[PDB]
Structure 1
Amino acid sequence: HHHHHHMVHITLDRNTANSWLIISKDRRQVRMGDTHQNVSDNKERFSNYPMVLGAQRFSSGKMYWEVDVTQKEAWDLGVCRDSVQRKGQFSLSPENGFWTIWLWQDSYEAGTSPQTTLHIQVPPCQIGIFVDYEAGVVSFYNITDHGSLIYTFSECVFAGPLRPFFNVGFNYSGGNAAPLKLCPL
Structure 2
Amino acid sequence: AHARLKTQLPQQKLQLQEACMRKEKSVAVLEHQLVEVEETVRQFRGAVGEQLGKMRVFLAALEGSLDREAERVRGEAGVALRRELGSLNSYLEQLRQMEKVLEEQTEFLMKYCLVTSRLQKILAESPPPARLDIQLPIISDDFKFQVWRKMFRALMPALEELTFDPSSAHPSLVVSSSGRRVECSEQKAPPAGEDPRQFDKAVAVVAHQQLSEGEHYWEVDVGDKPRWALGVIAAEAPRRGRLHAVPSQGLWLLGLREGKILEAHVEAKEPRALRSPERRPTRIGLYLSFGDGVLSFYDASDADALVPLFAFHERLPRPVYPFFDVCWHDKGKNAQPLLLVGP
* Shorter-chain TM-score range: over 0.9
Equivalent residue, structure 1, for 2:235? 82
3-state SS in 2 of match to 1:120: coil
Equivalent residue, structure 2, for 1:93? 246
Query: 1:99 Cα deviation (Å)?
Result: 1.2
User: What is the rounded CA distance, in whole Å, between the counterparts of 2:177 and 2:261 in structure 1?
Assistant: 32
Query: 1:184 Cα deviation (Å)?
Result: 2.1
| Aligned partner (choices 23, 29, 32) of residue 184 of structure 2 | 32
3-state SS in 1 of match to 2:167: helix
Equivalent residue, structure 1, for 2:201? 48
**CA deviations over 1:44-88 (Å, ceiling 9, x no partner):** 110102111111112210000100111211001011111221111
3-state SS in 1 of match to 2:301: helix
Equivalent residue, structure 1, for 2:291? 134
Equivalent residue, structure 1, for 2:173? 21
Higher strand proportion (structure 1 or 2): 1
- The one-letter amino acid paired with 1:112 is V
What is the CA RMSD across the aligned residues, in angstroms? 1.7
User: What is the rounded CA distance, in whole Å, between the counterparts of 2:185 and 2:287 in structure 1?
Assistant: 29
User: What is the rounded CA distance, in whole Å, between the counterparts of 1:40 and 1:136 in structure 2?
Assistant: 35
Query: 1:175 Cα deviation (Å)?
Result: 1.5
Q: 1:27 to 1:37 in 2, by over 3 A?
A: farther
Equivalent residue, structure 1, for 2:316? 158
Q: Which one has a bigger Cα radius of gyration? A: 2
CA contact (8 A) 2:232 2:320 kept: yes
Equivalent residue, structure 1, for 2:263? 109
TM value normalised by structure 2:
0.51
3-state SS in 2 of match to 1:165: strand
Runs of 4+ aligned residues of structure 1 deviating over 3 Å after TM superposition are: 37-41
Residue identity over aligned pairs, in percent, reads 29
TM value normalised by structure 1:
0.92
Gaps of 5+ in 2: 1-151
- The one-letter amino acid paired with 1:125 is T
Query: 1:116 Cα deviation (Å)?
Result: 2.1
- The one-letter amino acid paired with 1:140 is F
Query: 1:117 Cα deviation (Å)?
Result: 1.2
Equivalent residue, structure 1, for 2:109? none
User: What is the rounded CA distance, in whole Å, between the counterparts of 1:94 and 1:39 in structure 2?
Assistant: 26
User: What is the rounded CA distance, in whole Å, between the counterparts of 1:117 and 1:137 in structure 2?
Assistant: 19
User: What is the rounded CA distance, in whole Å, between the counterparts of 1:139 and 1:6 in structure 2?
Assistant: 16
The number of aligned residues is 184
CA contact (8 A) 2:157 2:215 kept: no
Query: 2:150 matched to 1:5?
Result: no
3-state SS in 2 of match to 1:139: strand
Query: 1:38 Cα deviation (Å)?
Result: 7.9
**CA deviations over 1:19-61 (Å, ceiling 9, x no partner):** 1110000110111112215885421110102111111112210
User: What is the rounded CA distance, in whole Å, between the counterparts of 1:55 and 1:85 in structure 2?
Assistant: 17
**CA deviations over 1:119-172 (Å, ceiling 9, x no partner):** 122211000000001211000011115211011111x23233111100111122
CA contact (8 A) 1:74 1:176 kept: yes
3-state SS in 2 of match to 1:138: strand
Gaps of 5+ in 1: none
CA contact (8 A) 2:213 2:291 kept: yes
Query: 1:98 Cα deviation (Å)?
Result: 1.1
3-state SS in 1 of match to 2:157: helix
Q: Whose relative contact order is higher, 1 or 2, with alpha carbons under 8 Å and at least 6 apart?
A: 1
3-state SS in 2 of match to 1:95: coil
- The one-letter amino acid paired with 1:177 is A
User: What is the rounded CA distance, in whole Å, between the counterparts of 2:183 and 2:214 in structure 1?
Assistant: 30
Equivalent residue, structure 2, for 1:57? 210
